[PDB]
Amino acid sequence: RNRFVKKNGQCNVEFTNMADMFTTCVDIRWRYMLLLFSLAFLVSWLLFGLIFWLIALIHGDLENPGGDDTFKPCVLQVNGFVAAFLFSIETQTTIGYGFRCVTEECPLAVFMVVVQSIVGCIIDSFMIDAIMAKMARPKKRAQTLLFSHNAVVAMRDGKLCLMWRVGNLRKSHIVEAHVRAQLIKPRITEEGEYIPLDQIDIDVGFDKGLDRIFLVSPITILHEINEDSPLFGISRQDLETDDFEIVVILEGMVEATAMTTQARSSYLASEILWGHRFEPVLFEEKNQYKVDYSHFHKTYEVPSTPRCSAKDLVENKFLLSN
Amino acid sequence: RNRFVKKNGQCNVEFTNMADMFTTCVDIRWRYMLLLFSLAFLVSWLLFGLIFWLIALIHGDLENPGGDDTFKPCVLQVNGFVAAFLFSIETQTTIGYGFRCVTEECPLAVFMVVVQSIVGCIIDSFMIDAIMAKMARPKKRAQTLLFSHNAVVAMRDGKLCLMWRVGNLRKSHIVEAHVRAQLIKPRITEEGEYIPLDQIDIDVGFDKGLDRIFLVSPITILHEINEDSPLFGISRQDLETDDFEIVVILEGMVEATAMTTQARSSYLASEILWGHRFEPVLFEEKNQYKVDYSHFHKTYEVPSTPRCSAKDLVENKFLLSN
Amino acid sequence: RNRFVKKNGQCNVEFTNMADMFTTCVDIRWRYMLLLFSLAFLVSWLLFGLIFWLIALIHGDLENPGGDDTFKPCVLQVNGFVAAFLFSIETQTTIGYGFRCVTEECPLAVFMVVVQSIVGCIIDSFMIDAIMAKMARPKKRAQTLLFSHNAVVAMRDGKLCLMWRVGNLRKSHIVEAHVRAQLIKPRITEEGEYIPLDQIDIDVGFDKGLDRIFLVSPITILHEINEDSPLFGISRQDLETDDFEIVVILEGMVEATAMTTQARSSYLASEILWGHRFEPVLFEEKNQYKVDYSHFHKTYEVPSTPRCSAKDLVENKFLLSN
Amino acid sequence: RNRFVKKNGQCNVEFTNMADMFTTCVDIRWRYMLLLFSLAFLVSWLLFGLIFWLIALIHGDLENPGGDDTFKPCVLQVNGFVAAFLFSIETQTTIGYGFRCVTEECPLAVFMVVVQSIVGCIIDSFMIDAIMAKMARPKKRAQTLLFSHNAVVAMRDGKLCLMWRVGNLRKSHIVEAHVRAQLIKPRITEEGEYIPLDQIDIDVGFDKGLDRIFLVSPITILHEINEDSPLFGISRQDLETDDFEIVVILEGMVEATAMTTQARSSYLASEILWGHRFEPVLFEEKNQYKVDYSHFHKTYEVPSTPRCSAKDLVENKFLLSN
Ligand SMILES: [K+]
Ligand SMILES: [K+]
Ligand SMILES: [K+]
Ligand SMILES: [K+]
Ligand SMILES: [K+]
């Protein structure tokens, strides 16, 4: 069976045979947004520069763009469309070098400077706001949360437990962090219904609230494999044959970014290590604890790990008493 | 009985016989906001343009707007109110073509350029901020979350279950997604109290946390109809007669928009299909799983579905043993 | 005993014998912020206008502010401090009428235009950002959520229940809404410890998740008074004598404002009505349900309501069987 | 054993042997950001000022920068690189004194004013947005939430309870506040696995939802030490010998800042006071309750507090009955 979720967290699914303006600004690439706005300015500057040029022609300002004791142009020094364009830039950008300067003569020209300024003012606001939308809502978010490459199975305090490690790469904390885990596989119900990919919970302590982690130094996430586990009947010899996936999730409000995140990784049946345990990454030093993230993913063998399933172990203790 | 909630999610209720400035900017329509600001500019530009015109009259600048070796206007080239208005625009917009230029002579005129600039500066800030308020808080949000048209009833693993499908239209994930469901109907209590529309929970697994979904490919939301269900006594023959509504809800933090959402749909008793199951939309391909959203809403008959209620089925197994 | 919480939601507590720059901008009043910034501009404009004036003196520009074939001022037309000030405004506001125009002569003056522009640019950014801080984080939030004036006690489906109504004033929904309730009173422990105001939970269905409301039309919030209630032994005759408070809370993410809210109200023992029920505000109309918020707070007598406590009622049924 | 968490809340851990642009702007210090932008302006202003200077040379504007009846410079009064630089500032800042004014002659110069304006416009937006990023996401957040210096152990209503006080310093409320507590210590499993710092929950009422606090006046956080506690076997005589840490956490959405917070403090075994209770900080006044935060941290002896562990107390009542 192919993967649903990849190690990085990416979901491996394609939609087929299937928008708000705000959200689309956050989607469109940077260079396409910066293009898109540059277009919005020209579209305005030309439009207006043209309006100002039309006005400059009808009033006869192209023949006498300076004016004199009698004649007075609507806008001074608009001798052609280039100057009409330059004025329109200078008015909306509000550079306004002033060589081309609007005069009192033409009420339309006055109205048109007014309109352009508001238009120009509205355009800028949208651009500023469009950008912090894109900055504050980045589709590339660095992977502050690290997952181990492998989950493992081992004995903790007399119970068989699937385990995987989660670790924070930034010193910035994660507020209200809580883990989940799911077994992903296709199954057919007792009434012969095919479920393409049935998602089945792997309990990590939601009922007592132990799924709530305080992640400072990398924590190992336990899952007791017992009656109510879906790995209950699965032994090490089954693990090689069996073909399932285990999605591990860590949701949390990350104070670095100030927005909630959903960390993701996957462990296929063939990525899980029976009879293994992780290398301690937290070490005592007189002054200060230190995490060494080089040993993060590393494990070691535990030969004294039962090769049979959790059920088998349960079934043995009942029979030895008889 | 008329509907409370529509298929789109809209609530069908009217308030009768019943504000912050920030929230009202998010309500007022765009064209009314853009009008509203355009007004705010004129109100200022005229106001100031008038103040500058009054000053230009009293100081005698309308008779000699250029000045000479002796006489020096407060602001140059303010020959009328048009030029006084143009100066006020040019000062607050900060275009400042400079033909109309404030001079050193009048301390009031100097103060008035100062005031206007700050006023103009404050106005712009409010406009920029008013707009990203409106962008970041849109009252039209695209329906990223899709609900099936029909819920259905069928047998899963030996239990009678009401089911409805939920699906994500964007590839963007939904963080901390969790489902609810409610049966909406008027009822009268045993002490003769009329409840216009009593909202009654339809359990989808809140107690063990199975109401938490990891929605990548469209999930079917189960509700086991058992002792504690309100559909417990309801059989297929009752379904045609009975008149109730079932609101289905999916709340979740949508990372596309970065704000929490409440997806809504409704299933009236006459919209629920007894003896049906949904068409698989997830299909195996060697490279990559694919969801086909054309089969999203579609179902098929299951004649082997018990036409009696969940209670009836329970009552049968007790009697066959005797 | 005096009140902890008022009807509006305000908390009645004073701190005695007890900051970030961002949060303090959200606290300081508007007129003090707008003052504060106006000061920030003058402080800069004067400062710079002075620097430019000093430069204009040392270079000898006050005697020949125009210049000629030989002499060329650092900045033209800075004949006094007024013009030096006007230039500094015109440079930082970037009006720049241009009558006072920086020239090539003085590298210091050139540096000083550069510095001022960046300073001016940084100042504006802070002002824009300071304002949307204040807009987006308003300390006055309209009371979209309405609480009834009175809680009541009555029989629902064979159990004695304290009840209070909550209602949404805007059509805008409240996402992930959930209720709480607390009994507030001073008490002394069995080991003689005085607790000034012991906060004690009044259960409204947190354990099964019924505390989660879908508030469209005003809901009545039930509290079953049973063994585990603190109103268990309290009868109607005790209610007049007893002196306690009941804080009712509704937290929820309000999509109108897009920020979480904590609605608050209080019911003192003397504000609770034994033997009463609320007036139906939802009415059936052929087209569309309608809530009438004029009957929101109103109740009616129920004489058939047991005047004894919930415990008494429990104690009666045990004794009638014997 | 050294500390994991300090009294202030700081975590005492170092990462060794181990980014998005948005988040890095929130990290970089202010003076380095303000430097960084000042650089961004010069880099542009020089770049463009150079481009304009190159153009001014090739067209021959340095020999005749004014122009005449025949010759007309691309940009007027660009006599050197200083004026070419001044023009580039005046164009991008949009001061545009206008002495140096772009003319119609050179289409390249016209294009270059256009490019610069958009570039300048894009730069400003990024700066404004970069700043409110830094303001809205401060790494220094004032400690609105106060923790007691010491936890204590004492008897409440017939049970041995570890207790610590939490208090709100601002009058601004904390929405959806909920407490946690953890015992931090290294331990070795029954299968000989060393856990550097095993985090173990100290129950404060998550299962019934009593971990949800409504913090107005400073609350004391109880932890019943019973069978399921990790302080169950620990007596006062053990407390001096034992070496463990107790991290206390309060997460909550703080309406002052409008962002979720994670308050932290620690109590080492040697910081906990057996046989003590806190000083009442809430006092009755006719008008208004008052909290006095001077008595916040203070306690008093309770000699009638059992010096033995909670288990011992349990073991005594079983034996006295026999
Ligand atoms: K300008
Ligand atoms: K200008
Ligand atoms: K100008
Ligand atoms: K000029
Ligand atoms: K100018």
CATH number at residue B294: 2.60.40.1400
Do residues C9 and C20 both lie within one domain? no
Do residues C99 and C190 both lie within one domain? no
CB neighbours of A73 closer than 8 A, spacing ≥ 6? A56, A59, A61, A64, A65, A66, A67, A103, A105
Residue entry with tokens 């709530």: A212
Please say whether the beta carbons of A145 and A166 come within 8 A.
yes
Q: Which residue type occupies C310?
A: A
Residue entry with tokens 């030989």: C70
Is residue D96 marked as binding? yes
Do residues B175 and B131 both lie within one domain? no
Q: Chain C: residue nearest D140 by CA?
A: C20
Please say whether the beta carbons of C124 and C148 come within 8 A.
no
The Cα–Cα gap between C55 and C62 comes to 10
The Cα–Cα gap between D191 and C269 comes to 58
Q: Chain A: residue nearest B217 by CA?
A: A13
Taking the CB of residue D256, how many other CB atoms lie within 10 A of it?
22
The radius of gyration of chain C from alpha carbons, rounded to an integer in Å, stands at: 34
Asked whether the beta carbons of residue A277 and residue D193 sit closer than 8 angstroms, the reply is yes
- Residue C84 has φ and ψ, to the nearest 5°, of -65, -35
Through-space distance between the first and last CA atoms of chain C, rounded to whole angstroms: 43
Is residue D185 marked as binding? no
Select from D88, D115, D137 the last residue of a domain. Answer: D137
Q: What is the resolution of this structure in A?
A: 3.6
Check which CATH number belongs to the domain holding A45 and give it.
Answer: 1.10.287.70
Please say whether the beta carbons of D152 and D272 come within 8 A.
yes
The Cα–Cα gap between A45 and B251 comes to 45
Q: Does D191 touch chain A (CB under 8 A)?
A: yes
Encoding tokens for residue C241? 């004598």
Solved with: X-ray
How many residues can be counted in chain B? 322
Do residues C43 and C130 both lie within one domain? yes
Select from D119, D137, D155 the last residue of a domain. Answer: D137
Q: Does B224 touch chain C (CB under 8 A)?
A: no
Encoding tokens for residue B223? 């509700």
CB neighbours of B311 closer than 8 A, spacing ≥ 6? B232, B233
Contact residues, chain B, for A96 at CB < 8 Å: 90, 95-98
Q: Which ligand is nearest to the CA of D93?
A: 1
CB neighbours of D88 closer than 8 A, spacing ≥ 6? D45, D46, D48, D49, D51, D52, D116
Chains that touch C (3 or more CB pairs under 8 A): B, D
Do residues A191 and A250 both lie within one domain? yes
Do residues D204 and D308 both lie within one domain? yes
Do residues B3 and B149 both lie within one domain? yes
Q: Does D159 touch chain C (CB under 8 A)?
A: no
Taking the CB of residue C128, how many other CB atoms lie within 10 A of it?
23
Do residues D75 and D98 both lie within one domain? yes
Instruction: Give the gap in angstroms from C-alpha A11 to the nearest C-alpha of chain D.
Output: 21
Domain with B75, as residue range(s), is 14-137
H-run or E-run covering B92: helix B81-92
Instruction: Give the gap in angstroms from C-alpha B248 to the nearest C-alpha of chain A.
Output: 20
CA of D105 to the centre of ligand 4 (A): 19
CB neighbours of C286 closer than 8 A, spacing ≥ 6? B2
Residue entry with tokens 């200083």: D82
Please say whether the beta carbons of C282 and C132 come within 8 A.
no
Taking the CB of residue B290, how many other CB atoms lie within 10 A of it?
16
Please say whether the beta carbons of A95 and D98 come within 8 A.
no
Do residues B31 and B117 both lie within one domain? yes
CB neighbours of C11 closer than 8 A, spacing ≥ 6? C4, C5, C264, D171, D173, D216
Please say whether the beta carbons of D22 and D133 come within 8 A.
yes
Instruction: Give a three-class secondary structure readout of chain D.
Output: CCCCECCCCCECEEEECCCCHHHHHHHCCHHHHHHHHHHHHHHHHHHHHHHHHHHHHHCCCCCCCCCCCCCCCCECCCCCHHHHHHHHHHHHCCCCCCCCCECCCCHHHHHHHHHHHHHHHHHHHHHHHHHHHHHHCCCCCCCCEEECCCCEEEEECCEEEEEEEEEECCCCCEEEEEEEEEEEEEEECCCCCEEEEEEEECCCCCCCCCCEECCCCCEEEEEECCCCCCCCCCCHHHHHHCCCEEEEEEEEEECCCCEEEEEEEEEEHHHCEECEEECCCEECCCCCEEEECCCCCCEEECCCCCCCCHHHHHHHHHHHCC
Residue numbers after which chain C breaks, C to N beyond 2.5 angstroms:
18
Do residues A114 and A232 both lie within one domain? no
Cβ contacts from C onto D, under 8 A: 178
The Cα–Cα gap between C211 and C221 comes to 9
Looking at the DSSP assignment, which residues form a beta bridge with residue C167? Answer: C146
The Cα–Cα gap between A61 and A100 comes to 12
Could you give the number of structural domains in chain C?
2
Is residue A29 marked as binding? yes
DSSP reduced 3-state for C289: strand
Please say whether the beta carbons of C239 and C272 come within 8 A.
yes
The Cα–Cα gap between A301 and A304 comes to 9
Through-space distance between the first and last CA atoms of chain B, rounded to whole angstroms: 43
Residue numbers after which chain B breaks, C to N beyond 2.5 angstroms:
18
Contact residues, chain A, for B135 at CB < 8 Å: 21-22, 129-130, 133
Of D14, D94, D113, the CB nearest to A290: D14
Asked whether the beta carbons of residue D155 and residue C191 sit closer than 8 angstroms, the reply is yes
Of A128, A212, A216, the CB nearest to D180: A212
Neighbour-count burial of C68, counting CB atoms closer than 10 A to its CB (0-12 exposed, 13-18 middle, 19+ buried):
exposed
DSSP class per residue in C89-153: HHHHT----SSS-B-SS-HHHHHHHHHHHHHHHHHHHHHHHHHHHHHHS-S-----EEE-S--EE
Neighbour-count burial of C195, counting CB atoms closer than 10 A to its CB (0-12 exposed, 13-18 middle, 19+ buried):
middle
Do residues B129 and B158 both lie within one domain? no
Do residues A321 and A178 both lie within one domain? yes
Please say whether the beta carbons of C184 and C246 come within 8 A.
yes
Select from A137, A172, A194 the last residue of a domain. Answer: A137
